[PDB]
Symmetry: C3
Subunit: 154 residues, 3 copies
């Protein structure tokens, strides 16, 4: 009994691991993940930047980051409306960095952006960035509520 | 050593349980579940009430129930058409009841509703309720087939 | 106490098996699987036939196969564009077989199809099959890239 039972349970566990792996692969496929390509997902909820970061982290992902023109379109395609990107200049004004560290390698800044505008009325300038429906970027208040779009690896 | 092996397997199972909880959260998210809000989902197949209860209960859910405005809205936006609500007046006509227990509070009936049209010839009167595209409710025979839309806790 | 821990472990694994089954049922439902019907899913990615086969097999599914008009409509609605079907005449030219075995029965060929056309330039004739926007079929090169649509049992 004992050792045989324990050995069986090891196989039961290993089997459940593979089944859950498959379940994850099937769910990623159903949500449009393309082979060897990172994928973006949203629940279409609007919330402040801090909450987006917290939510994506809780899903073991990150706030969507467009690294090139293709991903930028992929993100605008998933969001539909304005969405926060994992890029901010909170650490040093004027210097945008990825939430995952490092300076920008790609940008699609809209005409007259970024400007750290104060007139929004939420207080402070603008330290966060949103991708709008046309794919263009705009620095906005991290306090404002925009669509949460999480990114998961390729 | 048996005990060590056993402890290592307990740790594995705990990892699997966490991974499954994550799988569930990411799925809810991908299907639009909003933070702190009920989760409404549908496959679009229409069937009699008893079947919907059996189906949602198989998924550890309940037939949708719009307890307030936003919820009634969410349901009507996920249903796309006439879908059963978890409400019935089989204990006392006119006295609708949440299948989960409790007297009907919020409501969005249609004019001339409920009429309890006992005359369809398929099974008594109209003891069930369906929400339609316009969000309004109508009392319908529980024998009739309508869209299955389940709800899951916030 | 070894035996108590082993018995709790058995119960833990079963609870996990039960939870994963529910997760799979919920996912299929959210993906549009009707009761007692097989369901079709796509990530909307285009690739050669061998790739689609490999991908669906990895998910424990098979390349979509219409066995009647309803299923043909279901697949057509899911794909939204040209997609490979699990039907080919690669074993014996002119005779179409299902990838899971057996001679093709139900068909929905477009007028003048199949024609084993070589004029595409991809080399060889046309041994695979795509369902197009209107639901009609066309034999095509297995080397061409079409939408990956997988089928999972009822
Ligand atoms: Ca076993
Ligand atoms: Ca700034
Ligand atoms: Ca700005
Ligand atoms: Ca009644
Ligand atoms: Ca009525
Ligand atoms: Ca326990
Ligand atoms: Ca051929
Ligand atoms: Ca052809
Ligand atoms: Cl800010
Ligand atoms: Cl071919």
């Amino acid at each position: 009994a004992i050792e045989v039972k324990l050995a069986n349970m090891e196989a039961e566990i290993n089997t459940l691991k593979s089944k859950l792996e498959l379940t994850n692969k099937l769910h990623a496929f159903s949500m449009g993940k393309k082979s060897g390509k990172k994928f973006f997902v949203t629940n279409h909820e609007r919330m402040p930047f801090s909450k987006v970061k917290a939510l994506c982290s809780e899903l073991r992902g990150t706030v969507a980051i467009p690294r090139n023109a293709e991903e930028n379109k992929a993100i605008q395609e998933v969001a539909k409306t304005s969405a926060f990107l994992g890029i901010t200049d909170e650490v040093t004004e004027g210097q945008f960095m990825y939430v995952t560290g490092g300076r920008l390698t790609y940008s699609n800044w809209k005409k007259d952006q970024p400007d750290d505008w104060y007139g929004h009325g939420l207080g402070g300038g603008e330290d966060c960035v949103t991708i709008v429906d046309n794919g263009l970027w705009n620095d906005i208040s991290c306090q404002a509520s925009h669509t949460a779009v999480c990114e998961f690896p390729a």
